[PDB]
Each structure stands twice: as C-alpha cells, then as structure tokens.
Design an enzyme around this catalytic site. Structure first.
Site, mmCIF file in Angstrom:
data_model
loop_
_atom_site.group_PDB
_atom_site.id
_atom_site.type_symbol
_atom_site.label_atom_id
_atom_site.label_comp_id
_atom_site.label_asym_id
_atom_site.label_seq_id
_atom_site.Cartn_x
_atom_site.Cartn_y
_atom_site.Cartn_z
ATOM 1 N N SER A 33 11.198 5.273 -1.624
ATOM 2 C CA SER A 33 11.564 3.947 -1.130
ATOM 3 C C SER A 33 12.247 3.970 0.238
ATOM 4 O O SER A 33 12.492 2.910 0.824
ATOM 5 C CB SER A 33 12.445 3.214 -2.143
ATOM 6 O OG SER A 33 11.664 2.663 -3.194
ATOM 7 N N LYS A 67 10.915 1.929 3.273
ATOM 8 C CA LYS A 67 11.107 0.492 3.428
ATOM 9 C C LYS A 67 11.857 0.134 4.716
ATOM 10 O O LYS A 67 11.653 -0.941 5.283
ATOM 11 C CB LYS A 67 11.759 -0.094 2.170
ATOM 12 C CG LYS A 67 10.782 -0.110 0.999
ATOM 13 C CD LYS A 67 11.441 -0.192 -0.370
ATOM 14 C CE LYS A 67 10.379 -0.187 -1.462
ATOM 15 N NZ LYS A 67 10.925 0.086 -2.820
#
Ligand SMILES: *[B]([O])([O])[C]([C]C1=[C]C(C([O])=O)=[C][C]=[C]1)[N]C(=O)[C]([N])C1=[C][C]=[C][C]=[C]1
Ligand SMILES: [Ca+2]
EC number: 3.5.2.6
Length: 263
Positions: A45, A48
């Site tokens: 992640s 992002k």
C-alpha cells in the site's frame, strides 16, 4: 535500541526473508545509511503516495481537480475499503479519495484514483517520466499484494522509493501547494500507529505511509524530524518471511526506536 544497521540486520535474522532500509538527508538527498538499498521489495500500500503524486501532477497540469466528485457502485468495492464503502450514495472527491487511500489505506479509493490516471501502466509511466526507472506498478488492489518471489511486479527498491518520495515532497516536479498537500495527507496517516510513530518523541514531525500483505511482507515510507519539521526520509521494507503481523510490526518499531535514539 542497537545501532540502526545492527538492528536492521537483527530484524532480518529474527524474521527470515529480507529487510530493506535506507535513510536520506532531506535537504541534500545524501544517503546516510542503508541495507539492501538496490534490492526489490513489494510496495504494497505504500504505492498510494506515488499514486496521489501522479494525481497532483495532473492537477498542476490543469487536467484534474481535487474537488471533482466521483461516484461508484457496490460492484466497484474491493477488500479493505473502510472509507469508500461508506459513500456509495454521495461519492467522494478526488482529494477525499487521496486522503482515504493515504491515511486509511483504502483500496477502492486507490483503484478509483488509478482509473483517473489511466491505470498501473500510467503510474509507471509517471514514475519513469520523473526519473524513477526502477519502481513499477502492474496490478490493481488487492492483487498487487501477491508478493511472489521472484516477481518484479508491483515492486520498488529502498533507494528508488526514497529518492522518488524526496522528489515528490521537495522537488520542482509538483507545485508548492501540491507538494504540501501530499505531505499533509501523509502527516494525517491514521493506520501506522504501531510502526515508526510508536517510537516518535514529543514535538517531532512525521508524515508516513504504511503497507502490508497478509503474509510475509510489511513496509513504511516516511519523512520525519525533530522540532515540527521533517529533515530525513526513511524507507523500510520486509518480505519473504512467515512472520506474524505483530512480529513484523514490532521489528519496524524497534528499527524506528534505533534510528530515533541514534539520530
Ligand atoms: B496495501 O498494503 O496494498 C493493502 C491495504 C492495507 C494496508 C495496510 C497498511 O499498513 O497501510 C495494512 C493492511 C492492509 N493490503 C491489502 O489489501 C492486503 N490484501 C491486506 C489486507 C489486510 C491485511 C493485510 C494485507
Ligand atoms: Ca542477513
């Protein structure tokens, strides 16, 4: 609380798999210390932040507006979408989607944003175009977390990520307003408490973004420093182990404690 490189190597000893680490001086870009700086790790992640860098670049180019409202359906929802799943009726603005993707690791938010820029291939092109010829995004959430060794898909290296983050936050690539918006989202991170933040003394600034795969992998990217201003960039990745989430968290926290103690 050992010397930082010693602690990083110890973390790898305890976890198995590989741990990658780098610390950059924010002002100069100088590499202060590193371990496996040029080896690949899944971004998870942490991508992002780069995604929202690309979105902001489009805003700066007059091709996007943070206030633009996007609607979506229940059919668009993927796992780990705590914010977007609550706005099926009113939708969310591009800026709200970046806030959700960064501060809450919201997956559907990231996918919606990927759509706005033309997908993983265009994120990769954005990165290539700003001088990062290493980092690559190939898949959407959640498939990008698969973390197959020796898969180069959806990977970065500690030095590529640190260098790219520094350029996004301090470089002339984004406008001052957009650089500030990006670091503001990272500063407002809500889900990285057990990591570097757990070692942070009162009065320090931190802007960060974490990442996880179900098994084997964890990571964090950060700009932090004393006296309310960031002065260094830190990137830590881990992959290829059978370590529990608690174990992975603990090792990152202990690496953090070391780099703070020996700042
Ligand atoms: B990301 O790592 O690509 C995504 C969302 C996620 C982020 C974080 C974090 O610390 O920022 C923790 C947990 C999840 N990961 C996934 O979608 C992945 N399938 C997942 C989901 C739940 C728990 C672990 C991994
Ligand atoms: Ca080793």
């Amino acid at each position: 609380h050992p010397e930082t490189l010693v602690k990083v190597k110890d973390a790898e000893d305890q976890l198995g798999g590989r741990v990658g680490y780098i610390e950059l001086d924010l002002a100069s870009g100088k590499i202060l210390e590193s371990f496996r700086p040029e080896e690949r790790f899944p971004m998870m992640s942490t991508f992002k932040v780069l995604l929202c860098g690309a979105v902001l670049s489009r805003v700066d180019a007059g091709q996007e507006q943070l206030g633009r409202r996007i609607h979506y359906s229940q059919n668009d929802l993927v796992e780990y979408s705590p914010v977007t799943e609550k706005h099926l009726t009113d939708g969310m603005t591009v800026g709200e989607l970046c806030s959700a993707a960064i501060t809450m690791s919201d997956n559907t938010a990231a996918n919606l944003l990927l759509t706005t820029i033309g997908g993983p291939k265009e994120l990769t092109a954005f990165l290539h175009n700003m001088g990062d010829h290493v980092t690559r995004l190939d898949r959407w959430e959640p498939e990008l977390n698969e973390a197959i060794p020796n898969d180069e898909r959806d990977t970065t290296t500690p030095v590529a990520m640190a260098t790219t983050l520094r350029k996004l936050l301090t470089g002339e690539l984004l406008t001052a307003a957009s650089r500030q918006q990006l670091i503001d989202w990272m500063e407002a991170d809500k889900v990285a408490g057990p990591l570097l933040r757990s070692a942070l003394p009162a009065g320090w600034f931190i802007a960060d973004k974490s990442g996880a795969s179900e098994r084997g992998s964890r990571g964090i990217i950060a700009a932090l420093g004393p006296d309310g201003k960031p002065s260094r960039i830190v990137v830590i990745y881990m992959t290829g182990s059978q370590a529990t989430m608690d174990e992975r968290n603990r090792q990152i926290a202990e690496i953090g404690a070391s780099l703070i103690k020996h700042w």
